[PDB]
Design a protein around this ligand. Structure first.
Ligand SMILES: [Mn+2]
Ligand SMILES: [Mn+2]
Ligand SMILES: [Mn+2]
Ligand SMILES: [Mn+2]
Lengths: 291, 294, 294, 291
């Protein structure tokens, strides 16, 4: 299990300096892994990232969400294609890094839709994701679909919806990515979705209800972590948080980050690392007593 | 305290038939009050509502959310005017019903903004809401601003933000409307925002985390209702729920209701009435036990 | 699934009058079943209970806790015998009623021990419970061992302990009885012990953290009932509550009921029935939505 | 605010070696303060404790519970007197240490009673506690009554009961001591009792529902700490935990510690210190934003 940190804790700009900075800070906060927000994989400086990861002994993953121009759930084949092209480059970037996990909202745009999904849109999305998965698979990379709330997709809002989507595709390297922030809205509770997704669960984001400091909102982390313990989950567990104090040119607007929920990210990151690790220690003692 | 039900439990279409239907089913489910969604107050058949309510004994309130063309937080004063004219008609509708509560997202568009609020936009919102509140005042109508999550406004996402907004306007009939579904996202916990708003809290929505059946999501209703008890809240407590089974032409899309969270609204309504009353009974025993006779 | 009420809601004295009273009030409060506390099965007026139950339609079960003189976890075989004779009569009473569930703290004294269990004491408990279960078996009676907190036993404080106990005895009619009040103390959470016990779980008590009104304490009923849904539990679900207002000569003292948590048992019973059914309704909608037709 | 640790994490025997050991281990786990279980204040080696506290820069408090022989809620004046004598020595021990907080179940025996309290018993308890408080007061020591569950007293099971008890006594240095483990049973919720006891709240124990590792039971710490933040609580916050792995000759039997809930107390103590401190950090950010 890798304990990770999403890059937007540190910076919204991942040129060379931001890549080095984000990696250093992640390591200094005590994490094993940085998740790069790869909103534009075409301009991501792989050589710098590979160097910085080596210098600091850090593992890496990457996430993104698509947009209007790249929506693979569009009925417009050209838009679908732009999306597929973007996902393929993201996968290629991860291959060059020697990383193994790609994730995010890659089955639709990451946006507040104003109508429900279409049958033809959903078919396009599934076909495109299948092909991306296969390309990833030949490269040793796992692809995990992030279940997000109603205001960020109209396609996969629950773990059970994601399972059905995966069932159709039947790809060995396609998994599910759950995020406590999104679960806290859409799911019946914080254990059922973990039990249900069991072995398909390949990636986890730890976010508070308002995406600030862990333990300052309404997310039931105790139930969540106890359920992760029960299924023996051993994939990445990655802190994600957003404040108006650190802005990405698109992502922050897309996720509606209006509030200053923190200004000291060194404190935030260290706290989150301690929060997650100490939760996991607690869970380990429970599992130890089941002997 | 009135126990209320929002109209989208019953129908998405508030023509004459839908209005009578929502009133009847609301009463039959055990509620004291129906909340009409007044997305277009200009077309709402007030006389049918009056006669339905009189038939059934039932109290009414109304809520709406604004949209792009009617956004009173717009920098464009023509858009603000359009919004203000809409809010003013909503208020008039309520006056004609003899109702006393208007609420909702009436200080901005109810939408996912793509940039944060501007100073000019915020000043326009505040001035317009002030004028609407004054108008409401002389018609005996209380106006409460509903705090909602980051995806439905960029203006008032927390109770404390609403407090600061209210303090500047300083109007006696202006209050805060909290909704457990939105609190579940943006707030630090389910008690602090109640203790903070205290006497400014004038309206409450009871919604599960996914806006389905009460008790089937992750909202901490326990803490919430206990806090309501502590401040002695006596305002409306109104069930709200949305499913793809029952669709309003604009509201449902605006709120991102993609999923089929229920198909039996008779069952859903009856259950919500019971669920809310069973909580209220509980906290009544707690307050009783704080009595010095105990 | 029967929704049940424990007798100490209604009276502390189960003479003829108290028996009829508890049956009537239990039914009138909306329950399917009454649980008689059978602390002294030898004096219990079985024919009055039979005739009361027949009058009212109502199902019955029984529970007890043992005491020092009847402690089947004692190293002293004369004490174990006294206990076994008591349990055997409890079972006979239930047989005579045509009831099918016996439960409670029947594997030890229900008491605050001052030292941990011994090997000899544990072996005596197990052997006695085995014989009692076999006896029960041929009378069509299921026996479930209630897991309780450290202050009421030193033997079975967790579901997993009860599982290990059950595994050794390997009897088809022997099950586990969980009580949310006790789980709230000793267990890691409110779902794991349900998922672990699964098919061995045969009886459930619904009790608030302080054993008062449901929803007025800190028990996480949400998680609990959702777990019950997941394993498809269909056994008895029985409300239990104690107040100094209604006192049983020994039980109340044994359980440390010092406080006046309610005075109106009509209200309390009606509320508990509603509270439990409103939870069960909720989780039924969840299970319905896991159906492939959905 | 002092972050503290109860001595039974480390040892059940507080001779000189156990005193030094408990203090060292507490400091090494990262705490500010050790709480000595002063079940027998007459044989407590003050000189050793004072030395060990100085060597490690640690503050100290003391708690105890009374027993049958020393029950100040007895109707037997001789038993009441033995109890008062014991409490006075405990207070004297704290004075010699230069410590300022005495707490625990000092208004009755710490036991499962088999009958309710008596009017005459309660009067004896209140009078005795009043006198002990006055003696403490002349010595600069605060006295805090620990609210405990129905199986450990028949006198003070809720914060509100404790407030009423204090109301009668009207002593300036008499406060209330709340313990999450006991609240988790008896109280309506985890915030009301803090709001209600407000300025009378002078001491806090942090214990999980089963008194093992923090975060492995049912206690709602999030609500609890958020309420402590709201009232601006600045007294001791002290971890308490019990396992059959570490036994005190009386206390462990009195508290019904039948289970092995941990065996590595160095891990337990460090975890608890991190758990509490990181909770408090989270709360501070909430309070900071109320600006
Ligand atoms: Mn995420
Ligand atoms: Mn609402
Ligand atoms: Mn029970
Ligand atoms: Mn304590």
């Amino acid at each position: 299990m890798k304990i990770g940190c999403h890059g937007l804790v540190w910076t919204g700009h991942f040129d060379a300096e931001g890549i080095r900075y984000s990696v250093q800070k992640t390591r200094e906060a005590g994490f094993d892994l940085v998740e790069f927000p790869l909103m534009d994989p075409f301009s991501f400086d792989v050589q710098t990232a590979k160097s910085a990861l080596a210098e600091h002994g850090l593992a890496a993953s990457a996430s993104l969400g698509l947009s209007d121009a790249t929506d693979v759930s569009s009925e417009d084949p050209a838009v679908v294609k732009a999306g597929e092209e973007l996902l393929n480059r993201a996968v290629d970037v991860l291959a060059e890094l020697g990383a193994t996990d790609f994730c995010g909202v890659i089955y639709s745009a990451m946006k507040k839709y104003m109508e429900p999904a279409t049958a033809a849109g959903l078919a396009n999305s599934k076909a495109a994701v299948g092909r991306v998965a296969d390309r990833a698979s030949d490269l040793g990379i796992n692809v995990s679909l992030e279940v997000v709330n109603r205001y960020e997709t109209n396609v996969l809002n629950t773990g059970r919806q994601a399972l059905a989507y995966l069932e159709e595709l039947n790809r060995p390297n396609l998994g599910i990515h759950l995020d406590t922030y999104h679960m806290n809205i859409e799911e019946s509770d914080m254990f059922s979705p973990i039990l249900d997704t069991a072995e398909a669960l390949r990636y986890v984001h730890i976010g508070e209800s308002h995406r600030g400091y862990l333990g300052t909102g309404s997310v039931d982390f105790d139930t969540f972590f106890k359920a992760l313990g029960r299924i023996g989950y051993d994939g990445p567990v990655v802190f994600e948080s957003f404040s108006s104090s650190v802005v990405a040119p698109d992502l922050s607007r897309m996720l509606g980050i209006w509030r200053n929920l923190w200004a000291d990210n060194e404190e935030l990151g260290a706290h989150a690392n301690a929060f997650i690790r100490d939760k996991l220690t607690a869970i380990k003692t429970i599992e130890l007593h089941r002997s």
